[PDB]
C-alpha cells in the first residue's frame, strides 16, 4: 500500500484558503485525495475544520474535483 494520499500538516480552520506548508504526503487508509494533487489544490478553501494527521478527502475541498 504504495499510494499516497494528502494529509493535513497542520490543523487547517474551516474556510482557509490551503497553502503549501499545510499538506503533506502519506500512505493512509482511508485513501483520501491523491498526494500528486497538492500543486492543483493551493489556493482552494476547505469546508470543515482539519486537524493535524487527517486525511484530505475531495468532499473536504470547495470547487474539487479530480
Known amino acids: 500500500m504504495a499510494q499516497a ?10 474556510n482557509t484558503h490551503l497553502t503549501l506548508v499545510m499538506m503533506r504526503s502519506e500512505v493512509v487508509t482511508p ?10 489544490l493551493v489556493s482552494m478553501q476547505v469546508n470543515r475544520a482539519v486537524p493535524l494527521g487527517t486525511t484530505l478527502m475531495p468532499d473536504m475541498v ?3 474535483a479530480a
Open 5 to 14: 494520499s494528502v494529509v493535513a500538516n497542520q490543523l487547517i480552520p474551516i
Open 62 to 64: 470547495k470547487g474539487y
Open 31 to 40: 485513501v483520501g485525495i491523491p498526494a500528486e494533487d497538492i500543486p492543483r
